Design a protein around this motif. Structure first.
Motif, PDB file in Angstrom:
ATOM      1  N   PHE A 176      23.510 -60.779   3.222  1.00 23.58           N
ATOM      2  CA  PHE A 176      23.897 -59.432   3.622  1.00 23.58           C
ATOM      3  C   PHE A 176      24.053 -58.521   2.411  1.00 23.58           C
TER       4      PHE A 176
ATOM      5  N   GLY B  56      21.560 -56.168   3.430  1.00 25.60           N
ATOM      6  CA  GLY B  56      22.302 -55.331   4.337  1.00 25.60           C
ATOM      7  C   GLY B  56      22.157 -55.735   5.781  1.00 25.60           C
ATOM      8  N   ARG B  57      21.759 -56.980   6.033  1.00 22.70           N
ATOM      9  CA  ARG B  57      21.512 -57.489   7.372  1.00 22.70           C
ATOM     10  C   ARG B  57      22.294 -58.787   7.521  1.00 22.70           C
TER      11      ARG B  57
HETATM   12 NA    NA Z   1      23.477 -54.035   8.976  1.00 25.16          NA
END
Ligand code: NA
Ligand code: L2X
Ligand code: NA
Length: 220
Positions: free
Chosen positions: A39, A43-44
């Motif tokens: 992440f 960003g996931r």
């Molecule tokens: Na996200």
């Protein structure tokens, strides 16, 4: 350095999971740490497959439902070049042959970093990196029945840890009289255990239960 840290408020942490009766704590701690670092990079937030680790990381020195190490798990992902998602390779709480499929890999690493065996070094790591894989001495009745507050067990060992868990933060608490600083720890015994599956472990108290003795995180 920050006096309080909670990586859950940044989006790094999946919901609490349940290893069942398989000795796979080490794989839940490992996916936790890799979920955070994936992440941080992309960003996931994507839940990662513990069954993948249990079934496939024997060559790195892990022993399925009979125990293992987070570093060996991080080594597998590097060596393997991938790790399947939880949804593609769900958790069965038993050890089987490897069913890894690179088409469903959603994570990678380039090795791992071991933290010096110092609670101050773990603090720095948690503050700057993300959730950190650690091992604790969890073999006490008080840990099983923990509900709330800062966990302190006088008979806890700093040198004989037996349970992998995940430090997602740290802070301070004055809701209790006899303890104050804590590590915020995600466990893998489901949401019913502890405080929605989390525990506050006493911080800066003779390296309580060994929390700083086997700390590491993966490189992504
Ligand atoms: Na996200
Ligand atoms: O000792 C261990 N690994 C050594 C080893 C090395 C290589 C091959 C195999 C084994 C680790 C803990 C660790 C991890 C990293 C660094 C230090 C220490 N524990 C495990 O791998 C699983 O056995 C744990 C489990 O999930 N059991 C049920 C949950 C439970 C319940 C009560 C309790 O008191 C403790 C745990
Ligand atoms: Na296997």
């Amino acid at each position: 350095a920050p006096r309080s840290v909670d990586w859950r408020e940044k989006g790094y942490v999946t919901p609490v999971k349940n290893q069942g009766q398989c000795g796979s704590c080490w794989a839940f701690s490992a996916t936790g740490a890799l979920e955070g670092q994936m992440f941080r990079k992309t960003g996931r937030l994507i839940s990662l497959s513990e069954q993948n680790l249990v079934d496939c990381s024997g060559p790195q020195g892990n022993e399925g439902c009979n125990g293992g190490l987070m570093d060996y798990a991080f080594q597998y992902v590097q060596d393997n070049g991938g790790l399947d998602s939880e949804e593609s390779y769900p958790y069965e709480a038993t050890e089987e042959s490897c069913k890894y499929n690179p088409k469903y890999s959603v994570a990678n690493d380039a090795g791992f970093v071991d933290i010096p065996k110092q609670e101050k070094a773990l603090m720095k790591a948690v503050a700057t990196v993300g959730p950190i894989s650690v091992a604790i001495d969890a073999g006490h009745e008080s840990f099983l029945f923990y509900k709330e507050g800062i966990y302190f067990e006088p008979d806890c060992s700093s040198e004989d840890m037996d349970h992998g868990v995940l430090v997602v933060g740290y802070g301070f608490e004055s809701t209790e009289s006899d303890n104050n600083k804590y590590w915020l720890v995600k466990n893998s015994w489901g949401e019913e255990w502890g405080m929605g599956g989390y525990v506050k472990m006493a911080k800066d108290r003779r390296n309580h239960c060994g929390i700083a003795s086997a700390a590491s995180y993966p490189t992504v």
